[PDB]
């Protein structure tokens, strides 16, 4: 069912006016349209925003909207960028939301930043490799994002290239999207217990998800860092050891557990003999030391990755080299 009449003007809860354009993909399958500020002109293919629209009873859009309202207000992001001395922060900006009735059905909508391409497309176009430079630069910026969200009570649980989108105007800035199944692991400073949460059904994306998720417990901070670890290997090598067995979750879990216990064997498996990037192993060893409720030392993880950039004769110059 069509949610909008194209070119209609929708008014958010803050009474800000927006105009709806044509559909656009942002790496997922939701109902997403181009959007801009209300003006006399039509919404173009270069629109700076999108509007996401779902039935009011859709659980994921409610979860996502609450994340964006709590953690992604423009001024809150800019304050963090200033105080932490960052170039940018890859958390999409929240511009407004509301309720829209059409044909007796109730819809929720949310206005957010419009982005360019997802990284999965670019990865596939590059024969399923990213360079060591690229992986390290992506990962440093993902660590900034994870630190931010974690400090705002949320974990993502589903970091992967299809959820990483480039700034529409700047292809050296990567953003993490899709908070529909994000989890508030620390509401009002109280950490969730080491157990399943009946409110949560999602287990992540099987090839990348954490051992915690495989064990049926709610995601926490160490899980997000573990997920990033698996992504880095996938990106560097084109493969993960368990990728032919993704229909068998117990096999995937068993493999991940074994390779966490023996990280040298993972490096031997995934990289040419005696030629493994040392920062990846050090990253995984550091994450391995985290307990379920423990606050990561993000600056230590970043330093590990910076040692990698030094080792290849480079520096953190913010260049993704895509």
């Amino acid at each position: 069912a069509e949610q909008f009449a194209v070119g209609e003007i929708i008014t958010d809860m803050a009474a800000a006016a927006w105009k709806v354009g044509l559909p656009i993909g942002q790496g997922g399958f939701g109902c997403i349209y181009l959007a801009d500020m209300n003006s006399s002109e039509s919404v173009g293919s270069d629109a700076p925003c999108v509007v996401k629209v779902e039935p009011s009873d859709n659980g994921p859009l409610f979860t996502e909207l609450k994340f964006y309202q709590r953690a992604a207000k423009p001024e809150q992001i800019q304050k963090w960028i200033r105080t932490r001395k960052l170039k940018y922060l890859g958390v999409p900006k929240y511009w407004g939301s509301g309720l829209h009735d059409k044909n007796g059905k109730s819809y929720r909508f949310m206005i957010m930043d419009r982005f360019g391409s997802d990284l999965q497309k670019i990865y596939e176009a590059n024969a399923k490799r990213f360079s060591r430079k690229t992986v390290l630069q992506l990962s440093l910026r993902i660590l900034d994002i994870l630190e931010y969200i974690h400090e705002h009570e949320y974990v993502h649980g589903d970091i992967k290239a299809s959820n990483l989108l480039l700034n529409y105007k700047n292809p050296d800035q990567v953003y993490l999207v899709d908070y529909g199944l994000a989890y508030r692991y620390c509401p009002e400073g109280v950490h969730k217990a080491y157990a399943a949460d009946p409110k949560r059904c999602h287990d992540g994306t099987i090839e990348f998800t954490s051992i915690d998720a495989h064990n049926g417990v709610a995601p926490s901070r160490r899980g997000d860092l573990e997920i990033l670890g698996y992504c880095m290997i996938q990106w560097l090598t084109g493969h993960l050891p368990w990728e032919d067995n993704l229909k068998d979750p117990k096999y995937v879990r068993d493999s991940k557990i074994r390779y966490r216990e023996n990280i040298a064997s993972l490096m031997d498996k995934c990289f040419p003999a005696a030629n493994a990037p040392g920062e990846i192993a050090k990253y995984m060893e550091t994450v391995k030391l985290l307990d379920y409720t423990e606050k990561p030392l993000y600056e230590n993880l970043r330093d590990i990755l910076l040692q990698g950039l030094k080792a290849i004769g480079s520096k953190d110059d913010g260049k993704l080299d895509l």
Side-chain angles (χ1 to χ4, degrees), residues 1-84 86-104 106-120 122-168 170-198 200-246 248-306 308-309 311-314 316-318 320 322:
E2 287 176 285
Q3 306 99 334
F4 290 130
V6 69
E8 87 170 294
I9 304 164
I10 63 177
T11 297
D12 74 18
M13 68 191 263
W18 305 92
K19 192 177 272 198
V20 180
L22 279 181
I24 194 206
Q26 297 286 260
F29 315 114
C31 323
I32 303 177
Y33 298 83
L34 294 160
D36 206 336
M37 302 177 80
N38 180 45
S39 78
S40 58
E41 316 221 302
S42 289
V43 177
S45 57
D46 65 343
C49 301
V50 296
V51 57
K52 306 185 66 164
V53 57
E54 294 298 339
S56 64
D57 68 359
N58 185 267
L61 190 60
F62 184 74
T63 299
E64 184 160 51
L65 176 58
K66 290 308 302 160
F67 165 78
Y68 279 111
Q69 289 183 327
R70 289 168 174 166
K73 294 179 290 298
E75 72 280 8
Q76 171 178 43
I77 287 164
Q78 288 311 137
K79 182 162 182 196
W80 184 272
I81 286 168
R82 285 195 315 272
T83 60
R84 286 38 202 200
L86 307 175
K87 299 293 187 281
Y88 85 100
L89 182 63
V91 174
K93 279 178 178 170
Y94 167 66
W95 294 104
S97 53
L99 293 164
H100 174 75
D101 282 18
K102 184 158 195 94
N103 297 345
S106 305
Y107 297 84
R108 179 184 318 288
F109 73 89
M110 182 179 78
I111 313 293
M112 44 184 297
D113 285 335
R114 183 266 186 80
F115 294 104
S117 180
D118 67 80
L119 287 182
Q120 186 63 33
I122 300 174
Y123 174 72
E124 285 174 14
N126 209 55
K128 303 196 219 214
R129 300 290 185 290
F130 289 142
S131 71
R132 187 163 175 195
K133 169 66 170 174
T134 296
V135 171
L136 295 174
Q137 293 291 158
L138 288 172
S139 301
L140 286 164
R141 302 295 83 82
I142 295 163
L143 289 171
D144 292 335
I145 295 160
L146 296 178
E147 183 173 12
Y148 182 89
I149 71 173
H150 293 174
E151 289 297 301
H152 293 82
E153 312 185 336
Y154 279 87
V155 295
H156 186 281
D158 207 359
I159 303 106
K160 52 184 175 177
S162 69
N163 286 334
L164 290 161
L165 315 183
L166 297 181
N167 180 319
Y168 185 63
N170 184 348
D172 287 322
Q173 292 181 349
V174 62
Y175 280 71
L176 180 64
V177 306
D178 193 345
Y179 298 84
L181 302 169
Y183 185 70
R184 192 153 69 129
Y185 80 98
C186 205
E188 310 293 337
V190 178
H191 203 296
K192 293 276 186 145
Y194 182 67
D197 185 338
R200 188 183 163 80
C201 292
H202 198 57
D203 293 336
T205 297
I206 194 164
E207 61 268 41
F208 308 121
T209 196
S210 65
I211 288 160
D212 289 324
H214 284 301
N215 282 327
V217 300
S220 84
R221 293 175 282 197
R222 68 178 186 179
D224 274 2
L225 299 170
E226 188 186 333
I227 294 166
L228 176 56
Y230 302 139
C231 287
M232 286 191 303
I233 294 174
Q234 177 72 44
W235 297 338
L236 289 164
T237 70
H239 299 279
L240 287 164
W242 47 82
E243 75 192 352
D244 297 324
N245 290 95
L246 300 180
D248 190 348
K250 68 197 185 300
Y251 184 101
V252 176
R253 177 183 58 184
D254 182 75
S255 184
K256 291 174 178 169
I257 288 174
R258 285 176 180 275
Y259 286 126
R260 179 183 176 275
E261 184 62 15
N262 186 351
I263 286 161
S265 77
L266 181 64
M267 296 306 92
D268 291 344
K269 175 69 192 198
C270 298
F271 295 99
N275 190 347
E279 71 276 9
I280 303 305
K282 284 175 183 140
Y283 177 95
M284 293 189 163
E285 292 287 355
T286 301
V287 173
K288 172 173 178 178
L289 290 161
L290 295 169
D291 292 345
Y292 182 69
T293 61
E294 184 172 353
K295 180 173 170 170
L297 292 174
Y298 301 92
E299 206 46 57
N300 291 0
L301 293 171
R302 276 188 298 261
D303 285 339
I304 287 163
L305 298 181
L306 290 172
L309 286 167
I312 69 172
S314 184
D316 182 5
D317 60 356
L320 298 184
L322 296 166

